[PDB]
Amino acid sequence: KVFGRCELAAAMKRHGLDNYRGYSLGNWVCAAKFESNFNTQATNRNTDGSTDYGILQINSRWWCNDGRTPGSRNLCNIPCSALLSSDITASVNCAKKIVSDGNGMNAWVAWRNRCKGTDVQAWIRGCRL
Ligand SMILES: [Cl-]
Ligand SMILES: [Cl-]
Ligand SMILES: [Cl-]
Ligand SMILES: [Cl-]
Ligand SMILES: [Cl-]
Ligand SMILES: [Cl-]
Ligand SMILES: [Cl-]
Ligand code: NA
């Protein structure tokens, strides 16, 4: 599924991400824009053989099982395929574990490089939330 901007803002708020760990909804929407372009089916292979999945590009090195990332963990206790669903529940629940891990949203390198410190409220501007 390719979400619209305000459609994703609303879905993220419905699943309790808005102000989760102090990160406003615009931070989450911005991260999703630059990780996946709002596409739930986004995948990207890393040089180390791990794979990033879904709207928030969650990595198989730590967070999900794809059976093809040696030595990896599955800390969200999910198949990485669950992160590609039209329903964002698995991606949100896993993202809440990641952002609680100690480095906040810096876990998402695209958020650090393209969202952090910017006017992220622009990402929810106009949205009926
Ligand atoms: Cl957009
Ligand atoms: Cl915001
Ligand atoms: Cl594996
Ligand atoms: Cl594990
Ligand atoms: Cl699995
Ligand atoms: Cl959803
Ligand atoms: Cl933080
Ligand atoms: Na894994």
UniProtKB/Swiss-Prot annotation:
Organism in which the protein naturally occurs: Gallus gallus (Chicken)
Family annotation (SMART domains): LYZ1 (SM00263)
Gene: LYZ
GO CC terms: cytoplasm; endoplasmic reticulum; extracellular space
Domain named C-type lysozyme: residues: 1-129
Function in brief: Lysozymes have primarily a bacteriolytic function; those in tissues and body fluids are associated with the monocyte-macrophage system and enhance the activity of immunoagents. Has bacteriolytic activity against M.luteus.
Entry's Gene Ontology BP terms: cell wall macromolecule catabolic process; defense response to bacterium; defense response to Gram-negative bacterium; defense response to Gram-positive bacterium; killing of cells of another organism
Name recorded for this polypeptide: Lysozyme C
Domain of life, per lineage: Eukaryota
Gene3D superfamilies associated with the record: 1.10.530.10
Ranges in coiled-coil conformation: none
Subunit architecture: Monomer.
EC number in record: 3.2.1.17
Binding, substrate: D101
InterPro entries for the chain: Glyco_hydro_22, Glyco_hydro_22_CS, Glyco_hydro_22_lys, Lysozyme-like_dom_sf
PROSITE patterns the UniProt entry points to: GLYCOSYL_HYDROL_F22_1, GLYCOSYL_HYDROL_F22_2
Annotated GO MF terms: beta-N-acetylglucosaminidase activity; identical protein binding; lysozyme activity
